[PDB]
Symmetry: C2
Subunit: 366 residues, 2 copies
C-alpha cells in the first residue's frame, strides 16, 4: 500500500471519518481507521460496529494498492499539524505505516485490514434523492427531543418515515415530542425506520452546505446516505416507534399566537427563578394576554406579562420551561402558535406560518 | 434602597463583580453581591474573602440610599436577560428586593448588608500608576509559569517587583520560570510582593486593552488596583520567593536560533507520538540543524528536522513539550533564541529581537 496526497485532500475526509470513534475505544481496532488503495482511490472508513462512514479520496500522484488500519486521531493530528499544501506520503510496512512530509517522519502501529469490522451487505427497499438542506431542516427540527439514554431503547433514536411525496422525522423522550414533514418531489413507498442517535449526529455532520444532493437508501435493517464522496451507513434500531399520530391533541381549540423571540426571552427570564431541578413555570392565558410566572422552593418569584392573540377561555397550566425553550429555540420563526386544551392536557406548538413542524409538550405538576 | 438605572450601565459592572462563572461557592454569602446606594452612586461588591471587586455606577434618576445583598448570578442573569434599552427599577422591601423592567417583575431573596464580609482597612506602602496595557503585558508574559492548583508546590502566586523605573513579574513552578520587566516612567523603591494565583487571574480579568491609567497600591499584606470605576483588592501571600537572578543560566556556551512558528509546529507534531501521560521530546543539536524526536509505549516514533542557526558542541537534551510550547506561545514572535549549557542544565529562551521577557526551562530525562 503506498500513496502520496496533498494535505487538504486528506484533511476533511479524515475529520469526517473520525466521528464514529470515542475517547478511549472499547478495543484498540475501534480507535483505528481502515485505509484502502484500490483503483486509483484511497478510501478511509471509521466504524463503531453500528455505523460506518466511508470517504473516498481521488489519487493523482503514483500509488500502490493495499490496505491497513492505523490510529484515527493520531493520523488526523499528524495531517492537521503539517503545513498548508504539504505533500504527505504513506507507505505500509507490515506492523507499521510510515508517513513522510518534507523532513517530518512518523511511524504508526497497524492492525490488519482483515480484522477491521465490516458491516454486512444489505438490500435497499426504497431510494430517493433530496437537497442536503431538506435533510438538515428535518434533523434540526426534531433532534433535541430525542432521549438522552432512556431505558426504552426505541426513544434513543429518530424515526424516519417516507409516505407518498413526504419525508418525515419524529423524536420523543416520553415527555415531549417533535415531528417535521417535508415534500420530496418523489412518490415513495411507506417505510418507517429508527435511526440510532449517534447515526443522526453523523448524518448531520456529513452535510456541508452545497447543492450536492443527498441520496438515501433504506432497507429492512439498514440505511445509507451518500453526499459527494462520503457514504454513511448505519444499522437501524430494531423496534416499533410508538404511534405519535394518536398523541397529537385531538381538538386543541384555544389558539394563542405571539412573537417567537418575545415569548422565548420571557420564558428565558422566568426560568431564572424556577425550581432548578423541576423547572416548572405557570402560564395564565386570558383575553389577549399571556402571564408567565415562576417560583422556586425559596419563594423567589418572576412574572412576565406579554400581549398575545388569544380569545379562548382563561386557563392556567404548568410546563417544564426547558422543554418550552427547546421548542422555541428550534422554531426559527417570526410568530408561534400554541394550541391548548385544558390544564391537564398537552400543548401543541407550531410556527404560526407553517404546519411543517409540530411539537407537543406534556404539562407538569405545580 | 431604591434606584432606577439603564441595564446598559449595569452589564459590565455585574460581569466584573460576578464571575468566576460557576463554580458553586461553598460559603453561601460569597455567592451574593452587596449593593449600596450612597452619594449618588450604586456600588456593587463581590468577594471570596481573599479578594474583592468593587464597581461603581453613577445614578442620575431619583434614588434612595441603602443596602442589601442578593444572589449575584441570579441578578446578573435577570439584567442580562432583559432587552437592549431596558430600564431597571429596584426597590428593597424587607426580605425581598424587587426588580422591575417593562412588564417583567422579579423578587429576589436578600441577606443583610451587615452580614456581608469586611475586608478591613489596610495601609499602602508603595503606589504607582501605569497604563493598564503595561500590566496586561507583564501578566500575560508570565502567568502560565505559575504552578497550578495542587500541583501543591509551595509557591502559589506571582512575584511583583519594583526596581528603579521598572515593574517586573516572575512566575515559577519549580520546573520552568518566566520573567518580564517593563519601564513605568517613575523611579520607585525596591519592593517585592507575592500576588496569589486567583488574584492574578481576577486582576487580568479587569484589564481592557483600552489606554486607561491603572493605579496600583501595595501594602505589607494587600494589593489594590483601580482602573476606571473598578477597584480590585487582594491579600498577598506571605513568605519567600526564589531569586530569578540565581535561576538564570550563568554561562551558556551553546546558542540556537530558529523561526518561532516553525519550531512550535515541529514540537507540536513530534508531540503527537510522545507518551500521552508525560509528553516529552528529544532535541539533538548539531551544526545548522535541529532534530526533534518522540516515541511512545506502542513504539510509534516521530522525527522533525529543522534548519537553524547553531553555534556550539553537538548535544542531546530532552524537554517536556508543554513547557516549550507555552514559551513559544507567550513570545508570539518571528525568531527565538535558546541558550544552552549541557544535557542536564536549564535552558534560557527569549525572542531573538526583544529582551523584555526571558524564560528558563529545566530539561527532561527520556
Ligand atoms: Ca461492508
Ligand atoms: Ca473594606
Ligand atoms: Cl453487534
Amino acid at each position: 500500500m503506498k500513496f502520496t496526497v496533498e494535505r487538504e485532500h486528506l484533511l476533511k475526509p479524515l475529520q469526517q471519518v473520525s466521528g464514529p470513534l470515542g475517547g478511549r475505544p472499547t478495543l484498540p481496532i475501534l480507535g483505528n481507521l481502515l485505509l484502502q488503495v484500490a483503483d486509483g482511490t484511497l478510501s478511509l472508513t471509521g466504524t463503531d460496529l453500528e455505523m460506518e462512514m466511508v470517504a473516498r479520496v481521488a489519487l493523482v500522484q503514483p500509488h500502490e494498492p493495499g490496505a491497513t488500519t492505523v490510529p484515527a486521531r493520531k493520523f488526523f493530528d499528524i495531517c492537521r499539524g503539517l503545513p498548508e499544501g504539504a505533500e504527505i506520503a504513506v507507505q505500509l510496512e507490515g506492523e507499521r505505516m510510515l508517513v513522510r512530509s518534507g523532513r517530518s517522519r512518523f511511524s504508526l502501529s497497524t492492525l490488519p485490514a482483515a480484522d477491521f469490522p465490516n458491516l454486512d451487505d444489505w438490500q435497499s427497499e426504497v431510494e430517493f434523492t433530496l437537497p442536503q438542506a431538506t435533510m438538515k431542516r428535518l434533523i434540526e427540527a426534531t433532534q433535541f427531543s430525542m432521549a438522552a439514554a432512556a431505558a426504552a431503547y426505541y426513544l434513543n433514536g429518530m424515526l424516519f418515515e417516507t409516505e407518498g411525496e413526504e419525508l418525515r422525522t419524529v423524536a420523543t423522550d416520553g415527555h415531549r415530542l417533535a415531528v417535521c414533514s417535508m415534500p420530496i418531489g418523489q412518490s415513495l413507498p411507506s417505510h418507517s425506520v429508527i435511526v440510532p442517535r449517534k447515526g443522526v449526529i453523523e448524518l448531520m455532520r456529513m452535510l456541508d452546505g452545497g447543492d450536492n444532493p443527498l441520496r438515501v437508501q433504506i432497507g429492512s435493517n439498514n440505511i445509507r446516505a451518500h453526499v459527494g464522496d462520503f457514504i454513511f451507513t448505519s444499522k437501524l434500531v430494531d423496534g416499533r416507534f410508538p404511534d405519535y399520530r394518536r398523541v397529537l391533541p385531538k381538538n386543541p381549540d384555544k389558539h394563542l399566537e405571539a412573537g417567537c423571540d418575545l415569548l422565548k426571552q420571557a420564558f428565558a427570564r422566568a426560568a431564572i427563578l424556577s425550581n432548578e431541578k423541576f423547572r416548572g413555570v405557570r402560564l395564565y392565558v386570558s383575553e389577549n394576554q399571556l402571564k408567565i410566572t415562576a417560583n422556586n422552593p425559596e419563594q423567589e418569584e418572576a412574572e412576565e406579562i406579554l400581549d398575545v392573540t388569544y380569545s379562548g377561555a382563561e386557563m392556567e397550566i404548568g410546563f417544564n420551561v426547558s422543554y418550552v425553550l427547546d421548542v422555541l429555540n428550534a422554531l426559527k420563526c417570526e410568530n408561534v402558535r400554541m394550541m391548548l386544551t385544558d390544564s391537564v392536557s398537552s400543548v401543541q406548538i407550531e410556527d404560526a406560518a407553517s404546519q411543517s413542524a409540530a411539537y407537543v409538550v406534556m404539562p407538569m405538576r405545580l
